[PDB]
Design a protein around this ligand. Structure first.
Ligand SMILES: Nc1ncnc2c1ncn2[C@@H]1O[C@H](COP(=O)(O)OP(=O)(O)OP(O)(O)=S)[C@@H](O)[C@H]1O
Lengths: 192, 350, 192, 192
């Protein structure tokens, strides 16, 4: 269930859902696993805000355990293509793909909560078939791993060699360490 | 004859902390006197009239600005209201009612009606309500504005002078309205949210967005300065109606510190009234800074704090005033902040 | 099903759902298991109330058997970040995570019903894989257990060592015992 | 499906669902098993009626086979906290928890239908794990049984010893016997 609220305007009262009200303020929610349906919905929201105003900052709160890679990469290219600065915030958790979208936000407008947690690892996959086909799918996922590490270094500022060693296995990063790692800019402890 | 610098100097005695609004009004009124005084029968004729649109928060002193100006000003002044009006012969009120109300101030002199000024409050209350499948003919909404268009521009409407003793007179006077000035102003609600979205930043509900922490710490007024006609369209006003009022005023806000100034600097301040009331008795009235601070908080807590000063002050001195004639050999009265709260009694000096 | 009510206003009559009506009065309901979707919905409700009025107290009624930890920690940081005092009330039951959000409320504005019950235990987890991966997830969940005990002691006032001993196994605490333990301030037996 | 009705008012005609129409008259329905969601919904209804009118009696019709204990105890404390007299009626059946909420109503305003049936037994539970954990959960459920018997005696007027013997196993009570047992006040056979 979703509660309904009323926004008061001069013309009259209008009823909005909790998610649509925040959308009016250039705020999008990324919840649950990243799939083709959930990812395509966020893209439509960003484009709608671009047409309404291309000069206002967008805020993206991420709370997700990650998911499909191809679904997430569509959002990353969109955030960089559009003119507005997509601010990212980590609430609760940010897995491998959630962390990639987190650091891809606008530089200087990235935050993480004091008790949030980020986890990063290498892409997962698999295939069943002839040996010739296994080599094809293996080469493709290997290129993605190399591509995902190059972009991670660009926003985090670290070296490509460092990202390769840290992403060999699951690596959890607390909120303070994420700041020191260049993944985020600051922490929103209290309101000022 | 009245110089904008001189008229502004006089208004400063009655107005505190509002400067931009004074400059705007001074030019218009000076032009109005000049327009009516000078015949204008030169190569250039039919000079245009710049009507004034006043915007400000509730209880900011708009009514006092028109009335205090009317006090020193010779021409008559009236205080009408827009909410009572209802278009096309409806139950509420005919537009013509405004004109007949003016004549009483002008002693039924047509020449004096063109000289006088008119003021309207709560103009925002008639904002075009936009609900599509309800009526589609909003009497209280847009409809009222359409009727005022011809009125402000200029026209002659029949008005029974004095109402008539009985049917015997059965006559009406022709009153011009072109030369008449109109001051339509009201505290708009929700206007700050409209301009914030389009002018400053991505504010609102979210974390990074600027929260409304400065609800009372800072004044929203500075935002109103960047107002334009296009923003009023979203509010409900018709562009034609806005064209009739080119000039605009800001009247940012009243400050807690300004309340202290209102009690000391103005000639009609409450402190000076009670001070003279007791001076005749051979007693002096002293107000302390601590006492004024308590009054500000109490007035701020209640609605329309500016209009509530009389209640707070009167209750504090009601008991003392009763015993002052009875008491003898008392030359001074001291008021403390504790007395304002009601936990203490004012000190008496013999 | 959700019943519909009518709220009388000066402008006119408006129809509201039972949950949305209480939301208008700065009241949020936390029901069932704590997950990523339910938690992300409550966060938007808290933020919505902040813009309407940041000086009015919020009331949060909790009746839940607990759930995911990461979903609950996002709510904890939100209550502390925002300026309004988040009042918490325990109705029916408050499990491990429900108890952490209960005590995290503003001091002096925490209540528990006379027959409510609170339960606290240590974080639960598990992993299947190589020994190297088990050590990684084991170290991570251990930090959470230490972190959850530190914050519990901060609001309850107890010592870190006492919370560690009491959280080794399931521990049920009646409503009067919660007051003696510093978890709550009083009990709302009757209206005064 | 839920039928829609029309309520005639001075302002105009309004369409209401069958449950919302009765809610306007201070009537709440308790149907099915008692769970966290169904119980949390009824509590909001009681609070809504308190603000509308705190001096008018509330009527609560109960037809349920019982359910979770913790969900029901939140309702009992609520009925006792609020000022209005919560009238209770048993329709069809009233199990262990349904009977506790039935008898918990205001004294003198408790009724049972001529053919209704009440059943009471002891709390049910279970646990699987180490022996140390079983002892903890056993002591907890024992406190509830003792607490549930104490309150039953308080409202029914019987002695604690009598309630303990009668609640050792399932005990069915007809409508007339409920009056003799002090559980209810009268029977609403016909309208007078
Ligand atoms: N500059 C000022 N100097 C002294 N008193 C002031 C001043 N501005 C406002 N006040 C006080 O505020 C009271 C109300 O003034 P108004 O002009 O009626 O305010 P207002 O905003 O016009 O109220 P509305 O719009 O008619 S509801 C006055 O009676 C004064 O006590």
């Amino acid at each position: 269930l979703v509660p309904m609220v009323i926004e008061q305007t001069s013309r009259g009262e209008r009823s909005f859902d909790i998610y649509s009200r925040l959308l009016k303020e250039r705020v999008i929610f990324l919840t649950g696993q990243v799939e083709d349906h959930m990812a395509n919905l966020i893209v439509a929201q960003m484009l709608f805000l671009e047409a309404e105003n291309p000069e206002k900052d967008i805020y993206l709160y991420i709370n997700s355990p990650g998911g499909v890679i191809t679904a997430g990469m569509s959002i990353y290219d969109t955030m960089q293509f559009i003119k507005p600065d997509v601010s990212t915030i980590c609430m609760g958790q940010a897995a491998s793909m959630g962390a990639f979208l987190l650091t891809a936000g606008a530089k200087g407008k990235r935050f993480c909560l004091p008790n949030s947690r980020v986890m990063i690892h290498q892409p997962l996959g698999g295939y069943q078939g002839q040996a010739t086909d296994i080599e094809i799918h293996a080469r493709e996922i290997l290129k993605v791993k190399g591509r995902m590490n190059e972009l991670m270094a660009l926003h985090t500022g670290q070296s490509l060699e460092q990202i390769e060693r840290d992403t060999e296995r699951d690596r959890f990063l607390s909120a303070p360490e994420a700041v020191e790692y260049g993944l985020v800019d600051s922490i929103l402890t209290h309101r000022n | 004859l009245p110089t904008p610098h001189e008229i502004r100097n006089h208004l400063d005695d009655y107005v505190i902390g509002q400067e931009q609004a004074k400059k705007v009004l001074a030019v218009a009124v000076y032009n109005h006197y000049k327009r009516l005084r000078n015949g204008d029968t030169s190569n250039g004729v039919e000079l245009g009239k710049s009507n004034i649109l006043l915007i400000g928060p509730t209880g900011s002193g708009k009514t006092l600005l028109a009335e205090t100006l009317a006090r020193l000003l010779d021409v008559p002044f009236t205080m009408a209201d827009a909410t009572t009006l209802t278009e096309a012969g409806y139950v509420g009120e005919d537009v013509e009612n405004i004109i007949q109300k003016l004549l009483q101030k002008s002693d039924y002199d047509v020449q004096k009606a063109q000289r006088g000024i008119v003021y309207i409050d709560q103009i925002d209350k008639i904002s075009r309500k936009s609900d599509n499948p309800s009526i589609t003919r909003d009497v209280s909404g847009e409809g009222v504005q359409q009727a005022l268009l011809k009125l402000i521009e200029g026209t002659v409407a029949a008005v029974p002078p004095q109402g008539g003793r009985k049917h015997p007179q059965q006559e009406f006077l022709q009153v011009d309205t072109s030369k008449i000035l109109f001051i339509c102003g009201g505290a708009f609600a929700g206007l700050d949210k409209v301009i914030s979205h389009r002018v400053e930043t991505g504010s609102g509900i979210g974390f990074g967005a600027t929260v409304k922490a400065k609800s009372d710490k800072a004044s929203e007024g500075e935002l109103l300065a960047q107002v334009e006609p296009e923003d009023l369209i979203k509010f409900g006003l018709i562009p034609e109606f806005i064209g009739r009022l080119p000039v605009v005023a800001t009247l940012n806000e009243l400050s807690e510190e300004a309340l202290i100034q209102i009690l000391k600097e103005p000639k009609n301040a409450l402190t000076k009234q009670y001070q003279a009331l007791f001076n005749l008795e051979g007693v002096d009235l002293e107000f302390r800074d601590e006492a004024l601070d308590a009054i500000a908080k109490k007035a701020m807590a209640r609605k329309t704090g500016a209009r509530g000063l009389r209640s707070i002050v009167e209750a504090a001195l009601l008991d003392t005033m009763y015993d002052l004639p009875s008491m003898e050999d008392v030359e001074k009265v001291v008021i403390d902040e504790s007395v304002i709260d009601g936990q203490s009694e004012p000190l008496l000096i013999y």
